[PDB]
C-alpha cells in the first residue's frame, strides 16, 4: 500500500508542520518534477492515487520516482471519548518546496499533463518544474 515493515514504535506524536522542506527539493532523478507549495500530511492512499493516475496516463510506459514515503503512523479513536490513544489506522510529512513524484523518459507534453493530473489528487497546491544547472551535479 505504502508503509514501513518493522517499526521501532507503533505510535508517535503529531508534531508541527513548521518550516521549508529541508531537503528533497532539488529534482535528482528525472526530467520533470512535482513540488509542494504547502505543508501537509500526505497519505499513503493519496500517494498511490497519484502514482496510478500517472501510469494510467501513459501507456504503462515512462518511468516514475515518487520520493516521499509514509513512515509516520496516523492514529484515530472510534466514536468513543478519551481513554488512552490509538488506534491503527500512515502519512508522509511534506513541507513547501519538496519534490515528490518526479517522472522521466517521456515527452514534456506527456509528463506535464500527467503531473497536472497527479496533483489534483493531492491535498495541497503544487508546482510543475523541469531541471537545471540549479539542480547542480553531485
Amino acid at each position: 500500500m505504502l508503509m514501513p515493515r518493522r517499526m521501532k514504535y507503533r505510535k508517535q506524536q503529531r508534531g508541527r508542520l513548521k518550516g521549508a522542506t529541508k531537503g528533497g527539493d532539488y529534482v535528482a532523478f528525472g526530467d520533470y518534477g512535482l513540488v509542494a507549495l504547502e505543508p501537509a500530511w500526505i497519505t499513503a492512499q493519496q500517494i498511490e492515487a497519484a502514482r496510478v493516475a500517472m501510469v494510467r496516463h501513459f501507456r504503462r510506459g515512462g518511468k516514475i520516482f515518487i520520493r516521499i514515503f509514509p513512515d509516520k503512523p496516523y492514529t484515530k479513536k472510534p466514536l468513543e471519548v478519551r481513554m488512552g490513544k490509538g488506534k491503527g489506522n500512515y502519512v508522509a510529512v511534506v513541507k513547501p518546496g519538496r519534490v515528490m513524484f518526479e517522472v522521466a523518459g517521456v515527452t514534456e507534453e506527456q509528463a506535464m499533463e500527467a503531473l497536472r493530473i497527479a496533483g489534483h489528487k493531492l491535498p495541497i497546491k503544487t508546482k510543475i518544474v523541469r531541471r537545471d544547472a540549479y539542480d547542480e551535479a553531485q
Binding site: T21, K22, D25, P96, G97, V129, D132, A133, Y134, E136
Partner: protein
C-alpha cells in the same frame, strides 16, 4: 561556447536589499583570495542555464580585471526554488577537481531499437589543470550491450587530464 557575466564588489549593504534590488549576492575565492561580490540575477541566470558549473565563466567585474571562475556552489532557497547566493571559484595553474558533462555517442549499438537506454551519470568529477579543460567528453563504446556496467577509465579521457575517479562505478547500462 565561451561565457562572461559581470560582477561588482560589496562590503556593507545587507543581502536582503541587494536581493530586492534584482541583484544576487555571492562570494569570490580561491587559495590566494576571498572577496565579497554581487551580480545581476537576470543577467547571471541566462549565463548559468548555459554554463552550469560545467563550462568556465570569466566574470568580468571592475578594475576591470577579467577573472576565470568556476561556479562551485549555488544555494537556492527552497521555498521559491530560485538562487539565493553563488560561489565563484577563481582558477590559477594548479590542478583542480571539477564536473565534466558527458556525450553519449552511438546508436544503442547492439540490442538496438531497443532495450532501455539508462544513463546513470550526466557528469564526471575529474582532476584537471585549468589550462586544458575538456569542455565535453565523447563516450561511445559501441560494445554497448545488455546488463554491463562501464567503470571509469573506459572513458575517452580527453587529452588534458585524469579522473577524480572513483575508477569503479556505474555510468550506463541496457535492460
Amino acid at each position: 561556447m565561451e561565457y562572461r557575466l559581470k560582477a561588482y564588489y560589496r562590503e556593507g549593504e545587507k543581502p536582503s536589499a541587494l536581493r530586492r534590488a534584482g541583484k544576487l549576492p555571492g562570494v569570490m575565492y580561491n587559495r590566494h583570495l576571498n572577496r565579497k561580490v554581487y551580480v545581476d540575477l537576470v543577467e547571471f541566470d541566462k549565463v548559468f542555464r548555459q554554463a552550469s558549473i560545467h563550462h568556465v565563466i570569466v566574470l568580468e567585474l571592475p578594475d576591470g580585471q577579467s577573472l576565470p571562475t568556476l561556479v562551485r556552489q549555488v544555494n537556492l532557497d527552497k521555498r521559491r526554488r530560485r538562487p539565493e547566493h553563488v560561489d565563484f571559484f577563481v582558477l590559477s595553474d594548479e590542478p583542480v577537481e571539477m564536473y565534466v558533462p558527458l556525450r553519449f555517442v552511438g546508436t544503442p549499438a547492439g540490442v538496438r531499437a531497443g532495450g532501455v537506454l539508462q544513463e546513470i551519470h550526466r557528469d564526471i568529477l575529474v582532476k584537471v589543470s585549468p589550462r586544458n579543460i575538456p569542455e565535453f567528453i565523447e563516450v561511445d563504446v559501441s560494445g554497448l550491450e545488455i546488463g554491463d556496467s562501464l567503470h571509469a577509465s573506459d572513458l575517452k579521457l580527453p587529452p588534458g587530464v585524469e579522473l577524480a575517479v572513483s575508477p569503479e562505478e556505474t555510468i550506463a547500462a541496457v535492460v
